[PDB]
């Protein structure tokens, strides 16, 4: 039996060290991943690396041997490092949540207001302050209990059970875990709401239209470039390049920058807007719609044209009469829904609710925010039961057992190995991992 669990704990130790070193190396090697967000992720990965190298191995030894053979010095230093890493992780995540809040509320959406040199200082202080609040109360004996069972364990070298006084157990839990948790959960819930609120048609079209810097053929087969900007309907490749050289004003050779792609995207959206106001059929429909449904109407005009969207005589009728559910059924009863289902479904669903439920976490930066949300969420689900049980044991010290306390602590220790697997979501990290593993 002892072996069966010893192997499991060894696979945990290895998974944490392997995965976190891989995360740290990728952010330190590849310039594309050297962003302010990934600096905090590095801080988070190092906390988990110290957890897998200096905390879990000695924790596993303490359980299987049922005693502490590392002396009274390492017992306290080990406990301090354990408390440090958890504190450093939750505060780093809180800082990430705050960083992402100020990034999305500003016009430089998804870009951190903090510079790289300032971000390193934040991290440094998050480890210095967490260093003092974790080590000092343990090294200066402010944590120690005064009852007999506890004093026997402190004197005995072979005992390393973490007995604490009621004051420390509450004060440390609130300052080290609950305060940054509540703020993180409150501040990052707003981040998901700002993402769902501030996204307009410039992101809506960018998502379902895509972006390519080179000349490609659309679903219909015509030469297109950028964010669905149709160059020509002619089957000639040089005709497409000729219309591309005309539109931009230089010899592009069928290749453009992201700037030029956005400049054309602004012109196409404005031309769609103007075209709706021009067309007598689309003109009253656009006025009767709210800011979100207007974007859904411009989306259709961007894809089919003003003349094509004017064909929906029954759909346009009911969109002005506030009959969303019926108008959405008629949009499904058209060749547009049959041709491009995934896109039409999202546009129809936008007319349905009048919200952005269909475009949730579809944009690249939104998936990046969702990933960060999973990192925070997993940390909460893995550590909250331990801390809840920690405060419950202070109130009534005869409700939770020792085995239950240690088990929930290990659900928290196994959380150190989850992050690298969760980073696979990000396309930048996948490429980076399989490059370091030489695959």
Ligand X SMILES: CC(C)CCC[C@@H](C)[C@H]1CC[C@H]2[C@@H]3CC=C4C[C@@H](O)CC[C@]4(C)[C@H]3CC[C@]12C
Is the distance from CB of 391 to CB of 378 less than 8 angstroms? no
- Region class of 211: left (phi > 0), else alpha (psi between -120 and 50), else beta: beta
What distance in Å separates the CA atoms of residue 79 and residue 387, rounded to the nearest whole number? 16
Whether residue 209 lies in the annotated active site: yes
CA distances from 396 to 232, 391, 392, 393 (A): 76, 9, 6, 5
Whether residue 218 lies in the annotated active site: yes
Q: Measured in whole angstroms, how far is the alpha carbon of residue 410 from the centre of its chain?
A: 24
- Residue 124 is a binding residue for ligand X (CB under 6 A): yes
- Nearest residue (CB) to ligand OLC, 12 versus 295: 12
Question: Which residues lie closer than 8 Å to 60 by C-beta, 6 or more apart?
Answer: 6, 9, 10, 13
Among 25, 158, 165, 173, binds ligand TIM (CB under 6 A): 173
Total of chain residues touching ligand OLC, rule CB under 6 A? 23
Q: How many helices (H) and strands (E) does the chain have?
A: 22, 3
Which 352-411 positions form the footprint of ligand TIM (CB under 6 A)? 390, 409
Q: Is 26 exposed, middle or buried (0-12, 13-18, 19+ CB in 10 A)?
A: buried
Q: Is 233 exposed, middle or buried (0-12, 13-18, 19+ CB in 10 A)?
A: exposed
What distance in Å separates the CA atoms of residue 435 and residue 439, rounded to the nearest whole number? 6
- Residue 53 is a binding residue for ligand X (CB under 6 A): yes
Chain residue whose CB lies nearest ligand TIM: 86
Which 137-166 positions form the footprint of ligand TIM (CB under 6 A)? 162, 164
- Nearest residue (CB) to ligand TIM, 271 versus 406: 406
Among 98, 271, 292, 362, binds ligand OLC (CB under 6 A): 98
Q: Which of 208, 209, 243, 306 is catalytic?
A: 209
69 is in an annotated binding site: no
Is the distance from CB of 97 to CB of 187 less than 8 angstroms? yes
DSSP letter assigned to residue 216: E
Question: What is the nearest approach in angstroms of ligand TIM to the Cβ of residue 153?
Answer: 13
- Nearest residue (CB) to ligand OLC, 280 versus 439: 439
Is the distance from CB of 299 to CB of 201 less than 8 angstroms? yes
List the single partner that 25 binds among ligand X, ligand TIM, ligand OLC, none, CB under 5 to 8 Å by kind: ligand OLC
Binding stretches for ligand TIM (CB under 6 A) = 79, 82-83, 86-87, 162, 164, 169, 172-173, 176-177, 390, 409, 412
Binding stretches for ligand OLC (CB under 6 A) = 14-15, 17-18, 21-22, 25, 94-95, 98-99, 101-102, 113-114, 122, 129, 182-183, 186-187, 190, 436
Binding stretches for ligand X (CB under 6 A) = 24, 28, 39, 42-43, 46, 49-50, 53-54, 81, 120, 123-124, 127
């Amino acid at each position: 039996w002892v072996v069966g669990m010893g192997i499991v704990m060894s696979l945990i130790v290895l998974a944490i060290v392997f995965g976190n070193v891989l995360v740290i190396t990728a952010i330190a090697k590849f310039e594309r991943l050297q962003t302010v967000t990934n600096y905090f992720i590095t801080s988070l990965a190092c906390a988990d690396l110290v957890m897998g190298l200096a905390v879990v191995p000695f924790g596993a030894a303490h359980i299987l041997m049922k005693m502490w053979t590392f002396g009274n010095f390492w017992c306290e230093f080990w406990t301090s490092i354990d408390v440090l890493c958890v504190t450093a992780s939750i505060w780093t995540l809180c800082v990430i949540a705050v960083d992402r809040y100020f990034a999305i509320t500003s016009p430089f959406k998804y870009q951190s207001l903090l510079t790289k040199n300032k971000a390193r200082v934040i991290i440094l202080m998050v480890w210095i302050v967490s260093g003092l609040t974790s080590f000092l109360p343990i090294q200066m004996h402010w944590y120690r209990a005064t009852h007999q069972e506890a004093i026997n364990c402190y004197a005995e070298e072979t005992c390393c059970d973490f007995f604490t006084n009621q004051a420390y157990a509450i004060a440390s839990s609130i300052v080290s875990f609950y305060v940054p948790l509540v703020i993180m959960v409150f501040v990052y819930s707003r981040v998901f709401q700002e993402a769902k609120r501030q996204l307009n048609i410039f992101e809506m079209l960018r998502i379902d239209e895509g972006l390519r810097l080179k000349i490609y053929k659309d679903t219909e087969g015509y030469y297109t470039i950028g964010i669905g900007h149709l160059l020509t309907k002619s089957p000639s490749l040089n005709a497409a390049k000729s219309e591309l050289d005309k539109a931009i004003g230089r010899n592009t050779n069928g290749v453009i920058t992201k700037d030029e792609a956005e400049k054309l995207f602004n012109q196409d959206v404005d031309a769609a807007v103007r075209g709706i106001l021009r067309n007598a059929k689309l003109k009253p429909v656009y006025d009767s719609l709210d800011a979100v449904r207007r974007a859904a109407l411009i989306n259709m005009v961007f894809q089919m044209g003003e003349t094509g969207v004017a064909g929906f005589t029954n759909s346009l009728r009911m969109l002005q009469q506030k009959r969303w559910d019926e108008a959405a059924v008629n949009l499904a009863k058209s060749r547009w829904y049959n041709q491009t289902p995934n896109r039409a479904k999202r546009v129809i669903t936008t007319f349905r609710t009048g919200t952005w439920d269909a475009y949730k976490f579809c944009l690249k930066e939104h998936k990046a925010l969702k990933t960060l949300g999973i990192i925070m969420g997993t940390f909460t689900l893995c550590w909250l039961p331990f801390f809840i049980v920690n405060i419950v044991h202070v109130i009534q010290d005869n409700l939770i057992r020792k085995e239950v306390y240690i088990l929930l602590n290990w659900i928290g220790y196994v959380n150190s190995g989850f992050n690298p697997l969760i980073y696979c979501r990000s396309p930048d990290f996948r490429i980076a991992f399989q490059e370091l593993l030489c695959l």
